[PDB]
Design a protein around this ligand. Sequence first.
Ligand SMILES: NC(=O)c1ccc[n+]([C@@H]2O[C@H](COP(=O)([O-])OP(=O)(O)OC[C@H]3O[C@@H](n4cnc5c(N)ncnc54)[C@H](O)[C@@H]3O)[C@@H](O)[C@H]2O)c1
Ligand SMILES: NC(=O)c1ccc[n+]([C@@H]2O[C@H](COP(=O)([O-])OP(=O)(O)OC[C@H]3O[C@@H](n4cnc5c(N)ncnc54)[C@H](O)[C@@H]3O)[C@@H](O)[C@H]2O)c1
Ligand SMILES: NC(=O)c1ccc[n+]([C@@H]2O[C@H](COP(=O)([O-])OP(=O)(O)OC[C@H]3O[C@@H](n4cnc5c(N)ncnc54)[C@H](O)[C@@H]3O)[C@@H](O)[C@H]2O)c1
Ligand SMILES: NC(=O)c1ccc[n+]([C@@H]2O[C@H](COP(=O)([O-])OP(=O)(O)OC[C@H]3O[C@@H](n4cnc5c(N)ncnc54)[C@H](O)[C@@H]3O)[C@@H](O)[C@H]2O)c1
Ligand SMILES: [Mg+2]
Ligand SMILES: [Mg+2]
Ligand SMILES: [Mg+2]
Ligand SMILES: [Mg+2]
Lengths: 344, 333, 335, 334
Amino acid sequence: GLVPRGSHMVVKVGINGFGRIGRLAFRRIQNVEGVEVTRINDLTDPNMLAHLLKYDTTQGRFDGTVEVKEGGFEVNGQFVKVSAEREPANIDWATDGVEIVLEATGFFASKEKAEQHIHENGAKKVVITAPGGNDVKTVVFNTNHDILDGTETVISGASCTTNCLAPMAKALQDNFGVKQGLMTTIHAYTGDQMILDGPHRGGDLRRARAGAANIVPNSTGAAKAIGLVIPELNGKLDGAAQRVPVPTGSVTELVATLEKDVTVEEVNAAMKAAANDSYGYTEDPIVSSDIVGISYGSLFDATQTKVLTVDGNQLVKVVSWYDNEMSYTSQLVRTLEYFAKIAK
Amino acid sequence: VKVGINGFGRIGRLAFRRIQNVEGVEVTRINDLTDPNMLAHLLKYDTTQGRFDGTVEVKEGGFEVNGQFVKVSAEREPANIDWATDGVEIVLEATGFFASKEKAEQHIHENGAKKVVITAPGGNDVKTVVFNTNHDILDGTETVISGASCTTNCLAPMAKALQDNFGVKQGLMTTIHAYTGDQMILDGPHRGGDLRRARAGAANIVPNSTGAAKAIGLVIPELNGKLDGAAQRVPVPTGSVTELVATLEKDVTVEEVNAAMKAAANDSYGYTEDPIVSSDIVGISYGSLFDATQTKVLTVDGNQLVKVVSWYDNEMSYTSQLVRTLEYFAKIA
Amino acid sequence: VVKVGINGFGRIGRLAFRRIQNVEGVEVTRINDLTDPNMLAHLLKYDTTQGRFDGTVEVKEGGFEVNGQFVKVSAEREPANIDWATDGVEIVLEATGFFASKEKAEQHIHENGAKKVVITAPGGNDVKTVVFNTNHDILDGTETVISGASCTTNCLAPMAKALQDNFGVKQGLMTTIHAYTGDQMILDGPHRGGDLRRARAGAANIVPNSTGAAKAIGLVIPELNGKLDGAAQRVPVPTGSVTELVATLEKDVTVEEVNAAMKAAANDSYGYTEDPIVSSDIVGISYGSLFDATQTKVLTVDGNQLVKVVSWYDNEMSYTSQLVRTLEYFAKIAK
Amino acid sequence: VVKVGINGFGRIGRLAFRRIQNVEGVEVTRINDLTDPNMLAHLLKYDTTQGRFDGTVEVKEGGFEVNGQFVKVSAEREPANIDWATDGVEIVLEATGFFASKEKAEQHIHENGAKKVVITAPGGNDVKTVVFNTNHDILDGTETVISGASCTTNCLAPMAKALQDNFGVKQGLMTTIHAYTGDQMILDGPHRGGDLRRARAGAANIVPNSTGAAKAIGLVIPELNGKLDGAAQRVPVPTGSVTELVATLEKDVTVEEVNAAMKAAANDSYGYTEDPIVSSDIVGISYGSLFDATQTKVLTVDGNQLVKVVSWYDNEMSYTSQLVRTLEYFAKIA
Ligand SMILES: NC(=O)c1ccc[n+]([C@@H]2O[C@H](COP(=O)([O-])OP(=O)(O)OC[C@H]3O[C@@H](n4cnc5c(N)ncnc54)[C@H](O)[C@@H]3O)[C@@H](O)[C@H]2O)c1
Ligand SMILES: NC(=O)c1ccc[n+]([C@@H]2O[C@H](COP(=O)([O-])OP(=O)(O)OC[C@H]3O[C@@H](n4cnc5c(N)ncnc54)[C@H](O)[C@@H]3O)[C@@H](O)[C@H]2O)c1
Ligand SMILES: NC(=O)c1ccc[n+]([C@@H]2O[C@H](COP(=O)([O-])OP(=O)(O)OC[C@H]3O[C@@H](n4cnc5c(N)ncnc54)[C@H](O)[C@@H]3O)[C@@H](O)[C@H]2O)c1
Ligand SMILES: NC(=O)c1ccc[n+]([C@@H]2O[C@H](COP(=O)([O-])OP(=O)(O)OC[C@H]3O[C@@H](n4cnc5c(N)ncnc54)[C@H](O)[C@@H]3O)[C@@H](O)[C@H]2O)c1
Ligand SMILES: [Mg+2]
Ligand SMILES: [Mg+2]
Ligand SMILES: [Mg+2]
Ligand SMILES: [Mg+2]
């Protein structure tokens, strides 16, 4: 019943917030037939945004030409309009043919705030590049993108850590059954931390601290909110993060109790059988720099698996890598592409 | 004398720390953009400068430091700060947003402060003081003064020593500098339009401009227009070094240059012959620490290029100089 | 005064020396490494993570003076060839990382050598492994070689013992998010221990690696023998670490009850905090382990509970403080 | 099709191997280091600063296969004991850092050994020292041991040559703000070379240190012999560096005139940019030197000028690109 458009039917997309996720989403969209970005909105001039697209500390030089123009810039000869409108309600997305908006500022990550993009001369639909609350459909591609029918006005692409955790947790559930579990993500520092110790605008006394000079504990909702993606794991997981001095690249550990008894070999085999474009599998003893720029949402590491058996009881440890930037962005663009095709 | 701090940031908090050991000054009011709990926590725990030497306890509308209450406000406009309510005569303007005569003067009003010390360059019409180099230019009648920049407090005594001993014709400066709070933690839009400070500060060598060499005339009049320079910002969270390459009026040796610096040494200008690194100068009380191991004198066909190098903790070196100037200014006010 | 020797004037060796300056009745009279006195004196004076030395250090022939007092330096590669007795040394801190076994550490004990040795690391299952204020009562003074355990063991031990004593532990898994150390390469290159992860640039990566602390916990807390396992994620801070333990318990608990149990167990070795601190805040501390109540979790699902407890440690100074406490105690009961 | 050996499969050795995959007429048939094939294969596949290897690498007995082609690995500590000729090797890239002189590099040349050696570092004053596209014309092909110079020399040389040719150089001082390297300690500890600054934690400090690039420039540009000196400030980036030169010239100049001269000197080795870039932007580039027009200064005081010129270089890939250019040329004329 979905009657998806062909990739020859080009859907025009807008990006609100040309930041880490916005710029990398723009990069990946260059290699997607059927989606193209015609409007970028941020809080700055075209020259700043053009320069940040061209040159990228962790993700390398842009694959193509970028040239600044009046009110925008050209990417491989094709003009992209830039505006500097602080309020989503005041962005005229329809002027540039934009139907779907990537909401990637971090400031409008709810149904009510994201819907500000939807108005007369605005957009039709919004994909929030973050958790969007419990009343918004939350999609990890290749785990639950089949929940979309195309009539939705606002959807969520989840978080980076959710896209890492989801396929790993789903594999445990489907093969062995999960009773409960606790997650720790050892995570790259991100733009919501201070470069040096100073007052954090969100009131967080740990994100106030120098992000590239500390191990910084911090909260995450990924394990607690996993029910939005995998309903059968609702309320079964919790977790937190340890943010550390790498500029991108992260890893998720899950310690769980299962319904079935297992061996390390059986756990690793289950993950390998679950592998696809989104969920990767490796037995190489890699480190974080090796996963920067990958296209897997999640990369299971069979070298870190543990099964501890004591007096008939087992604790199981599973670990998956993710580039919080590109792994997430790859999933986001897979979801955007699919959503664009079935959109109604 | 009772002091106020506008901007309880890196310089503001370290200025508060040093003021705890200065008899003549005490802080009775802090103004920023946040609640007391945030500021108290940031005072207690410091990534580069260590745990606070004392007790800090959050109260309603402020916090107690070793039992003594300090009022906290969150007033965005200097004009709206009621400094006189807490007896404040002099304000340390340390936000980075009001570093000019006109903007700093907003602190001075009915129920406000009397005087302001800007913790940064403040323009050509504000007296710019490096303690132990030119603090004798103050008479105490000034409303707004400047404590200069971190790099100016490093450069000044070293350049002055070259001038007094050998005469300076011209020179170029490179400061290899710690990343600071005006850089982005990761690549993103820089609100000051700077395409290099837009970049991830702890993951790059980042070229950037500085006014210290160009504006040296404000501190050392005889060097006016003789120097220029720039910075290379690098991934350390504090601690910096200033290299000056200069032509001199007199011929010199490495040993004569080093001896001149040693003779110029005092509480502000230090001397070392130990092959140290940047972590070794974190938290020092010298404004400038000359390093004799890095001195060069290149003689080619009778002509000399002379290289002199001095360390500074852009945080604690500058803050020590700032508080010396504040103390002296408060006494003669 | 018990006279002590240090073999390996490295991170632990130099910080042990620093702490010994504030212990009356122990002094270092001999240092042995693989370099000249000028190199060692400079590394004592200046310290990237632990700050400038609190005192004067001046190089002399065959050693250096610390606050006017001479300390002899030698460059002897073989422990058997060190004449410790010449300088009155009875006990040696073996801190090279190369002689961490009973047979290798015993080489210090010979004619004109030392009497006893404290290995600054795990030393095998036939050497008594001591975490101060957890199990230092196992020492009688007649031992020749003992172990101060690892940094992670000194962090984990009092936290795990507190869980056991109050609630009973069935099993648990440990992750330590750990500062990079000197056994990692500064940039990608061949690792002489054959480790393909320690081969990688240690200050530019999250690096998984193994640890024996949870597996070997039975050596310190016999009732937890075989009940724990774990691993490490080494990350780009030059010192400062944290240990997370996820465990199942024999009793049902709340977050408040777990935190109260840790506070009641607090002493000179095991600290307690409710401040939301980060790794830089624990650099240079004297606690072997600093419990962080802000990170505690108790997840209850269908009547079953998983418990998370987390403790900070400066792998350098926290361990060194525990090491010196054990050294001092061992020295004064020595027979 | 000339067969090459690599002694020291390190940062320069592994990246040289990578570049050689895309050079027709040169191939590596032998690698020598101090470890097993599994360690070296892993280090080729995965690279912190330079990214994943573009190809398949599979470990075998006594070596590894790269895209199906076997490369022999040995663990011989002494250059004299390496049987290079067994695997057809004529030229050896000496990239260990331990045999960077004529006498020590010549140990590779014996019966059943190699014919020629290219030292991946300064090799002393009696070895021909080549920066490609600056002075590779000094080679005739009869040499047994040559040097590819240092990373800093390959950065400095084309920039200093352009100043000399256009304006004339009286004297100058160099500061290179340089990535930390494998000769520094990861944390504070005894430095085997006796250097009290390289003893310090390299990724947590600004570390002054010596360099020979400016002092030894005469080996590359004879007319600048004895005219320059310099030093380095090593800082916490794992690769990527920049060289500043402050100089007095024989002619008066403007900023525009200096930049135009550099642009006119640009080629495959010497790049030109006016973009305000940072160190991460030059990681993995193929220029030996990338002049940055945004950093140029000309200070005129009482008729006298000091001129500042600045060029970027990835001390790893920029140098390696130059090294492989010189190796390719040297192989063809041998
Ligand atoms: N960085 C990651 O690893 C990551 C991973 C997954 C999800 N996310 C999510 O993606 C979003 C963006 O994160 P990021 O790391 O790219 O942040 P960022 O700070 O790099 O990007 C935010 C951008 O939004 C712009 N912006 C802010 N307010 C705006 C406004 N009112 N109107 C227009 N533009 C505005 C900023 O100028 C900036 O360019 C957040 O919701 C974040 O949680 C980030
Ligand atoms: N950090 C250094 O190395 C250094 C050295 C010398 C001079 N300085 C100068 O000192 C000043 C502060 O630098 P910093 O590094 O401490 O900055 P910072 O960002 O650490 O501190 C700035 C503080 O000002 C507060 N603030 C901002 N706007 C405000 C307003 N309108 N009202 C009240 N408070 C406000 C912020 O909340 C923050 O706490 C600048 O002028 C800087 O150039 C800094
Ligand atoms: N660094 C930590 O966080 C930490 C914590 C707890 C335990 N440890 C343990 O302490 C030991 C030392 O660790 P470190 O970090 O201080 O290492 P390090 O590399 O800093 O110190 C080792 C020292 O031993 C010297 N040395 C090497 N071989 C020698 C020999 N044959 N004779 C004499 N001296 C020799 C080296 O020159 C160096 O000074 C190891 O067993 C380590 O596992 C380290
Ligand atoms: N890394 C740079 O930025 C750079 C730039 C230009 C030139 N260089 C020069 O290149 C050379 C190597 O530097 P690097 O950074 O690649 O060093 P590295 O330490 O990364 O590589 C050295 C390699 O040589 C091996 N080795 C050591 N002794 C050996 C022996 N006796 N026999 C065989 N193999 C041995 C080591 O195992 C290691 O793999 C040095 O001469 C250096 O000065 C380095
Ligand atoms: Mg497209
Ligand atoms: Mg006081
Ligand atoms: Mg003592
Ligand atoms: Mg080839």
